[PDB]
Design a protein around this ligand. Structure first.
Ligand SMILES: CC(C)(COP(=O)(O)OP(=O)(O)OC[C@H]1O[C@@H](n2cnc3c(N)ncnc32)[C@H](O)[C@@H]1OP(=O)(O)O)[C@@H](O)C(=O)NCCC(=O)NCCS
Ligand SMILES: CC(C)(COP(=O)(O)OP(=O)(O)OC[C@H]1O[C@@H](n2cnc3c(N)ncnc32)[C@H](O)[C@@H]1OP(=O)(O)O)[C@@H](O)C(=O)NCCC(=O)NCCS
Ligand SMILES: CC(C)(COP(=O)(O)OP(=O)(O)OC[C@H]1O[C@@H](n2cnc3c(N)ncnc32)[C@H](O)[C@@H]1OP(=O)(O)O)[C@@H](O)C(=O)NCCC(=O)NCCS
Ligand SMILES: CC(C)(COP(=O)(O)OP(=O)(O)OC[C@H]1O[C@@H](n2cnc3c(N)ncnc32)[C@H](O)[C@@H]1OP(=O)(O)O)[C@@H](O)C(=O)NCCC(=O)NCCS
Lengths: 402, 402, 402, 402
């Protein structure tokens, strides 16, 4: 049988067991300083585990991080960031995750979070729990030997070569300004900043010691990697720009790396980069995947918190097959502001809870989910209004991975 | 030393010259019947050529095809499909294309086409001539051994295994119905259908003989090829679905190909495929690039022909650095329909002509162009409205390559 | 409602349907003349099909070939060679195969075949139907620049360079002699020889026209190709050797091919080749897989037909989860000769029907099957004796693929 | 020169010389702690060297380890494990190995070892010295995303996730149980366990730090590595299972590693793994090579120490082209026990000494050696009897590399 236990706080011996299970279940684990940084974000009663039959090792674990997320319009919501989820390879597919998630989401609801959020190791896990893909990350690789900037593109200058660690406060404030105006922005505590700028050798998936370009309103952190042959590439770890000027200035700097063949980055689908070039094909998309996932815990609170770009007057029937967070709601939007209240009236639109989360930061169209029968309406004209309302003011992008 | 001449009709001897230049300039050329099918679509006075010093050969050529394009909301416009553009590698970068395009577009304008359209061999060529990227093709590969359908995805059945050459009329009608509903749709004449279905071994890149799945409301044409090892993959040449049911049923058939490891397709960004699966990541994007380019020749006609997703009342200053097809226009969109009138009033929004063409089928947000200074307004609220209006209710996809 | 239909005889029209379905199901199909050669081996009432709702096409098919298989000891048994098995991708995993196979095996049993045999497109299909892997094919690649023959190894001479198509009868007779002495040998009809020696381009696999080395007591057919780049490679299509002298002579000729880098072949696990070399590592196994599968239809007939390598006296309980061809059998083996009679007596050894087929040509140890609980006995030393008895005195190898 | 000498003991000064030559001759060398552990198993008078001109360095070396090998039937024999064999690249192919081997084997014989054993850097070296390939290692790679366990396969549970360095004694205990039951088993002293469990970075071969699955009756040690693509793979360093249940349970744990694509291991040809799966092809063999080589030093003692699977009464003439350890022997085997006595009687079977060693742990058939004239008889049925007798009841596997 499966009986999860909610740990009031995590003792050192608990973390040792959490690290061991995670390293086995995932196949590797981040360095100790990174683990400690994440652990420091877990609030009370936010760790759910399943002990082995002698109450020694954990065979299942899950926890959440106390976080703050920017939504469309600029409102910042407290959200529970699910993390360190793992079930021992010896105990998988027996309902351990489901048991753990049932308790964990009770804890999250009890604590008042209007949203839970996560990034997923695999794409087929969390839909069934009501999580929708809220942002998309695309891998873009730029051939900097061929790329040229469009004659109209800004060339504002003002970029400096920086030792990142010497500018912790400056970089953190640029990120904060970006965070406040970008849906998907997350508050990034000091511990995370310190770990990033520590730049530990283990931390390197693009090879080599951190470089940084700095601008008044943006920065880019990157690493250079050498091929067997001897061909250099740059991997942008993070590029955060508050203004279009900064974004362009930083890209001009990056594409100015003379002995570098290609520059790559994980970015959002509407990155201005290719529009800045004379030939947009030089900014090559090589992959695209889900990034931030969102489960709406409290539909009225979530829907009223964000802003919209079209008016709407509908009754939504939100289907929740995991918890009871769905039901029928009157959704009335005017002036880009929504009122969303429980109702008994017949629904105009039926929508799966995960779909509602997926649309929440403005990342998808309704017609794809509609084709899949996960969103439905007798009135296809209404569906379009709905999709148009949920569109975003600013392209969404997850501030950092967790 | 460059003087284009316009061919009133294309003689067999003229075409022999055109084929020769095309083959040299491109490095290869389609089969005879294929060429003949395209030639059959060229109207009067629609070919511009530049001969060599002794009028033995052409060292420059360009022509257009008489075509019909579906725009957002369903109006079908006559359009000039530019094709077989080539300048001898011995005469390149001397202004030969520029000279030819100048004359060709004069002809297009005199013939009354509101749009010119093309597909580009490279991405850095046509922006300067006012062409914007109007649709996007993404290469998607599905690991069919791992993909599973979402519990809600339609499973209507009704798919037959077809000899495609035996159902020319049925396939053509399905295509026609898709065409009428989908921006980017192009009328496809009998000659093209015949050539497609002839399935000639040279135009047979990426597999063996065609297979076809047929549904009342859709079809998929595909080929299978072998790895050196002996592993098989399927490449969908064309999948055309009038309804969501047909699209789903066809994908279920393709993903049921037992001995095939992967199924790939060149599709559009908003293909419902990933929404049909339990794990959307299994629909893997491996490339994304420009497909259809559009130059608006007649701003009022083009803007009034399409429907819009939001209402607007602005003055638009359209910059044309190639011809005189821009200027200031009052654009008033009301109930999703536009009146567009030349005016002297000051502008609210400045936009490069190519950008207007690129937005024309709903394929982009405004942010990229704006950041690049290719679309300009002192009111950023206004630009977002403008982008919202130009969105489409149906995802755009070019009917076929030309 | 799956109602299989048995074809009393195959009409040209039926075959047209069979070829269409096979091509869709497999991803392609062998040449018409090859199909015809297989078709010539199908006896009456040996084809079972399932029509589509329209009764136009088949959505399922299966058939068997009338064949003759050599078993350990030299006895030659009539066997039904299952082939052309396919279910339409639109109709799979609905029990169509099971329904067809149920009828087809009823037909096979009524025709009196003691064994049914097949080669499998995938390894997870036929176990559940009682088929065991009876031979193993290993891909072996020899670096002929480095390989050197052991000082003791035969160097008989006697090999000629042949135009194989000019030597059909001589080749055929060498194969026949090999067939009579090798378990797994299949009678190979003139139609198959003719098709092989026709060497139709379609089936070459990128390799060139056939070469053949000829010996009094053996032959090798091989092709050469040069993939990237200019480097040549030889793939042996078939090496059939009646004597050890011929085997060695043929290999010395193959490894004498001066401009060839590597010689490869699909052979059996106990091929003498590496034992002929000073460094056995130069004969590199790169792959290993099931080749021939056998389902014993008549346990007494099958077991009494073959000879055994040790004496035994046991009761077998053979489990058949598909038909009723198992039961308890008294197996008395004396002088390498078996009497197998059904009994009510309690069993010493319990074995799955597929396992019994798998052991039938001497290909496995009992250990793996026992660990997997597919073969069971309290007296573990009795299992070893069972294994010893079922060993062969000549390594088994499938005569040809089908 | 060549004038070898035997070190009575190895001084730190000598060992430094041995490590210098080894590094040069091999192109690299294990860490100091690893060397020390091997050095600790070298008994008296067990190192043969050839000094350079000045006697300040060696230009040739060879030594043996005092070891204990399990043979079929379970007797454990003292054996001499040859290691650190090296000749300076400046002194090679002048007969220095041969000269050293002559003295070393005199020492081995004088010390009383009935067998000498080694693993080979290349496959063509040691057969000439009377060493036969006694065990085979195959690299198997499992696609764990597709692999599924057969419905009959044991599912015993009981597997724990261990920090292997915290369970040295428990792991050693399990290995000792396995090695006593498995021909090829080798006593593994504490020094080797310590070195293995110290898991030094330079020994990890790209993979990360060790994982261990532990069971009451088995363990698996493995590492995980990433690719450029960020995909993970697991390589099993060692899987040691006393029972069938333990073996199945460990593989179930391994194939349960959710984020790993493939799990690989170097195992023996008769590993039960593919028999545990529904599709045996998912356990893909990708390589196969010699592992343990054996030279029989004392034919009567070696042949009498092991047990046999069948009875036999023949005279062997053993050909030894390197020493004089061959001759004619009366081999009488009854009740699986052999008496082997030197004799003048004429032989029924002639066998090269290396072949006798190759057959000694049950790994081969006679067919190959016979075809190569390395094993000879007029009575071909007597050869099969000889082969059946030398078969093993437990599949042989080398305990560890040395
Ligand atoms: C992912 C995870 C914890 C699953 O735990 P689990 O206990 O096996 O899951 P459950 O048994 O509760 O499964 C619940 C349901 O989700 C499904 N599911 C679980 N993991 C899945 C995966 N990786 N992909 C797809 N579906 C999955 C199950 O099939 C089941 O569906 P069903 O209800 O229709 O039967 C586990 O496999 C694991 O530890 N994996 C490694 C990845 C990881 O560490 N965690 C995720 C980081 S985001
Ligand atoms: C493409 C094409 C016909 C160009 O002809 P061309 O006569 O060299 O072009 P022009 O000299 O008139 O060039 C006009 C301008 O476009 C630019 N241009 C032309 N071809 C270009 C290309 N492939 N990429 C980028 N820019 C290009 C020139 O640099 C020039 O810029 P400028 O005005 O600032 O000087 C020619 O290169 C060709 O035939 N190549 C093969 C590709 C092809 O077959 N045609 C297009 C298939 S859609
Ligand atoms: C193999 C094929 C004919 C199966 O037909 P099907 O009608 O889908 O099979 P069924 O529905 O009767 O399946 C029966 C059982 O076999 C199982 N099976 C396992 N692996 C399988 C596989 N690759 N294909 C089909 N069934 C498989 C089914 O899951 C089912 O198991 P269950 O009873 O436990 O649920 C079909 O997949 C096909 O046409 N593939 C091309 C390859 C081929 O034809 N075989 C070559 C002959 S070797
Ligand atoms: C292996 C080793 C020490 C050879 O020393 P050597 O002094 O060159 O050998 P010899 O000259 O005494 O050669 C003896 C015989 O074996 C043969 N031989 C030696 N090395 C061989 C090899 N790598 N492959 C094939 N044959 C070889 C010789 O040709 C010679 O044959 P012959 O008697 O018929 O002429 C040496 O090559 C070396 O140091 N290699 C590096 C790794 C190593 O030693 N391996 C041991 C790991 S088990």
């Amino acid at each position: 049988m499966i009986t999860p236990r909610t740990l009031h706080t995590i003792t050192d011996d608990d973390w040792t067991r959490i690290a061991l299970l995670a390293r086995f279940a995932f196949g590797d684990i981040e360095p100790e300083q990174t683990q400690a940084a994440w652990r420091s974000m877990v609030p009370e009663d936010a760790t759910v585990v399943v002990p082995d039959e002698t109450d020694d090792a954990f065979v299942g674990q899950s926890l959440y991080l106390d976080m703050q997320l920017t939504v469309p319009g600029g409102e910042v919501l407290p959200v529970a960031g699910i993390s360190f989820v793992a079930v021992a390879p010896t105990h998988r597919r027996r309902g351990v995750l489901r048991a753990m998630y049932t308790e964990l989401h009770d804890r999250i609801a009890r604590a008042g979070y209007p949203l839970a959020v996560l990034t997923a190791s695999e794409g087929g896990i969390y839909g069934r729990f009501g999580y929708g893909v809220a942002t998309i990350e695309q891998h873009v690789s730029v051939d900097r030997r061929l790329a040229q900037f469009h004659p109209a593109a800004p060339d504002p200058g003002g970029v400096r070569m920086l030792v990142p660690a010497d500018h912790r406060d400056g970089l953190a404030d640029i990120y904060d300004r970006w965070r406040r105006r970008t849906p998907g922005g997350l508050v990034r505590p000091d511990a995370l900043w310190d770990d990033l700028l520590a730049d530990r050798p283990e931390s390197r998936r693009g090879g080599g010691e951190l470089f940084a370009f700095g601008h008044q309103d943006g920065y880019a952190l990157y690493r250079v990697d050498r091929g067997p042959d001897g061909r250099r590439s740059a991997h942008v770890v993070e590029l955060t720009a508050v203004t279009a000027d900064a974004h362009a200035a930083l890209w001009r700097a990056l594409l100015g790396l003379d002995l570098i063949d290609r520059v790559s980055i994980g970015t959002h689908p509407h990155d201005p980069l290719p529009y800045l070039l004379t030939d947009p094909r030089q900014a090559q998309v090589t992959a695209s995947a889900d990034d931030l996932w969102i489960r709406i815990m409290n539909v009225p609170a979530a829907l009223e918190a964000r802003r919209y770009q079209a008016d709407l007057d509908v009754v939504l029937d939100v289907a929740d097959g995991f918890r009871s967070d769905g039901g029928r709601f009157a959704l009335q939007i005017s002036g880009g502001r929504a009122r969303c209240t429980t109702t008994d009236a017949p629904a105009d639109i039926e929508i799966d809870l995960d779909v509602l989360g997926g649309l929440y930061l403005g990342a998808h169209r309704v017609d794809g989910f509609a084709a899949a029968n996960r969103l439905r309406s007798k009135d296809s004209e209404l569906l379009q209004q709905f999709g148009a309302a949920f569109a975003g003011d600013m392209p969404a992008e997850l501030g950092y991975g967790f």
